[PDB]
Design a protein around this ligand. Structure first.
Ligand code: WL0
Length: 133
């Protein structure tokens, strides 16, 4: 009953500061423009200890499966090859990505009927809000 309140199908409904976040991460102009238009659907499921998070959009379809606390390799939508570790901290999924000596953290939390995604790179935060589909 690990992550129950995250499981389901979610649709992006608002974004703030995502272009600046992507700049900070190193995403180039054309990818930022196209990626910034996307309205992904996020599909989260759990089977035993394995959590799966899929993102489907006109830009890219991605999928990660993982066990909490256990590092895995991830190719991000912007084509970074990162080493990721996801843990639960007080009910928040905390996802750290490491690559080329850099780090970014993505937090996912349930707030009311929303799933709120906060992406941080150095001093720059983007907030992405999802509703149930
Ligand atoms: O906020 S969420 O889309 O849930 C997590 C965001 C973390 S990083 C990047 N996401 N994308 C991205 C992913 C899907 C669709 C459009 C853009 C980049 S391009 S870089």
């Amino acid at each position: 009953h690990m992550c129950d309140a995250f499981v389901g199908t979610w649709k992006l409904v608002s974004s703030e500061n995502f272009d600046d976040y992507m700049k900070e991460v190193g995403v180039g102009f054309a990818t930022r423009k196209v990626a910034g238009m996307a309205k992904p659907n996020m599909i989260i499921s759990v089977n035993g200890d394995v959590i799966t998070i899929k993102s489907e959009s006109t830009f890219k379809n991605t999928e990660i499966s993982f066990i909490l606390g256990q590092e895995f390799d991830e190719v991000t939508a912007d084509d970074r090859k990162v080493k990721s570790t996801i843990t639960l901290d007080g009910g928040v999924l905390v996802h750290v990505q490491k690559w080329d000596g850099k780090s970014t953290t993505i937090k996912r939390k349930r707030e009311d009927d929303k799933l709120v995604v906060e992406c941080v790179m150095k001093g720059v935060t983007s907030t992405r809000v999802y509703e149930r589909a």
